[PDB]
Structure 1
């Protein structure tokens, strides 16, 4: 079942930021909901850059790229100064460097991408006709419950992809480590749709090996710092004793 967990404290975290959010937690036994807008858990949103996890799996699986490839910066202006360099798929994951993942998506091509997204059953599994932006503006949408299930399957090497491909993508997703707890995950922020949606979807590998998956999903506004997603996640995972 999917139930609200214990949390007046986490409800208050979201309220203090003056926005609506949910945090979905999946253990080997249960799915629990936390936050101040629990109906978000079963609502579809554009995945934004969380879809890089699946883009990478599909690109690597189909040998459109490899973890050693250096993607060339051809010199154009890019939203962030940090993106204006040659980099690997794994580097671009961490920077959320959309141009690299757009180049990859074009290599995959609309037809293979739609076939793979249908095979995985990700969200509504609709990609439309534009292969290089369907995750940012639609029509692809996915609920937070569906994202936490996807990322739990990746964490356990249970997606229907090569084991080595799943290991390679997991290795691109390490965000932080605290006292032997490793926190993996991928941020997203769809800034160009209304309302704006922020994500942080991932899992914790605890020191004894246990895995606890998460999907944070919240309404963003343009004044917020991008770090808000990480801040609310970390504080909540501490409150729940997951880290």
Structure 2
């Protein structure tokens, strides 16, 4: 089809190894310049915030209303030097807030929860607030896509209201009836560095298309390339048309 050519020609300009996986609940589809990335495991980086919020809410370690207060120590971004709810920190990808959450869960409960839900290789190592940024936790694009697909559907092994709350923490924008939810990632501490843009498009019809961009990153890259490439792809596929 011509839509496949349109999508592949998008990647034919990107000077970085990339894969974009889709999942409509039945078919996995892969596009990009290196399809084998879809089956390769990378650290989740900030996409792990999804599982971290789910585990923390499920296990009475935080609420979606609770305020995670700034402790006064300057964070990496001046924008992070304030108080956040888990929702607000999800949109800002505020790493220190989610590290505080991981420490509340603790390594024993984090480990057993990741085994219970089967998230990636389920390895956390010995630093409970570092494993998704430096390893040893890894996950494939195919695994990320089926994970967030189930989140959209309320079919993860979590309480239904916990999934609903984390689902709307991911809410980016709606276009007419169709809703985009997404979370970006950039694992800089590993080699190669890995970039993520994972999420799903919910139609008012109820159909869901989950997606995961996974691409190699270099220091200095355009931080906005992950989201703009994913939205380009979704429009060319006719999943999430530009308005």
Check whether TM > 0.5. Answer: yes
Structure 1 stretches lacking a partner, 5+ long: none
Q: Deviations over 1:31-51 (max 9, x none)?
A: 111111100000000000000
Partner Cα distance (1:146, 1:28) in 2 = 13
Check if 1:146 corresponds to 2:146: no
Choose from 84, 88, 111 the match for 1:87: 84
Choose from 198, 218, 221 the match for 1:224: 221
- Tell me if the contact between 1:7 and 1:35 (Cα under 8 Å) persists in the aligned partners: no
| CA apart distance, 1:164 | 0.3
Partner Cα distance (2:186, 2:47) in 1 = 9
Check if 1:26 corresponds to 2:23: yes
Structure 2 equivalent of residue 107 of structure 1: 104
Partner Cα distance (2:123, 2:145) in 1 = 19
Matches within 5 A, 1:53-68: 53-68=50-65
Check if 1:183 corresponds to 2:176: no
| CA apart distance, 1:6 | 5.9
Choose from 68, 71, 84 the match for 1:71: 68
Partner Cα distance (1:192, 1:128) in 2 = 16
| CA apart distance, 1:225 | 1.5
Q: Which moved more, 1:66-75 or 1:205-214?
A: 205-214
Partner Cα distance (1:216, 1:104) in 2 = 26
Structure 1 equivalent of residue 158 of structure 2: 161
Structure 1 equivalent of residue 202 of structure 2: 205
Partner Cα distance (1:18, 1:45) in 2 = 20
Q: Deviations over 1:15-36 (max 9, x none)?
A: 3120111111001321111111
TM-score, normalised by the number of residues in structure 1: 0.95
Partner Cα distance (2:98, 2:190) in 1 = 20
Partner Cα distance (1:85, 1:52) in 2 = 19
Partner Cα distance (1:14, 1:142) in 2 = 23
Check if 1:135 corresponds to 2:112: no
CA-based RMSD: 1.2
